[PDB]
Homo-oligomer: 52 residues x 3
């Protein structure tokens, strides 16, 4: 059925673009962890400049 088949492939589309966004979300969540882990280093270097 034309319309029945349409909506499904319309959905395969929508779902594909969703995988896409996870991909990059997973990606920049992971950049954020790294950005802040580096911040702890800096902060820890500070603390071991006071009580040294």
């Amino acid at each position: 059925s034309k319309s029945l088949v349409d909506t499904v492939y319309a959905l395969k589309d929508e779902v594909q673009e969703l995988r896409q966004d996870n991909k990059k979300m997973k990606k920049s969540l992971e950049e954020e962890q790294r950005a802040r882990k580096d911040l702890e280093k800096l902060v820890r270097k500070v603390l071991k400049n006071m009580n040294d």
Copy 2:
């Protein structure tokens, strides 16, 4: 087909609520970046209070 058509629209539902969650996830990931970028400022102000 009743059940065949049901599951598809059942899926259109499920997929719509997924776009929704990306939306807000994208959203609070973005709030987190900002929250921590502000933290670097603070930390950097600290470092340029020691070696000034």
Copy 3:
């Protein structure tokens, strides 16, 4: 229809594994907030060691 029915359940699969990933993404986004909120504490303790 065999193939028509296949792609739909093929899609129910794909969509289920997507909910899964949100679940854990929501999860580690939330771990990240906590990890950095703790960092502010540390940083704030620093600032209230200088101007005390």
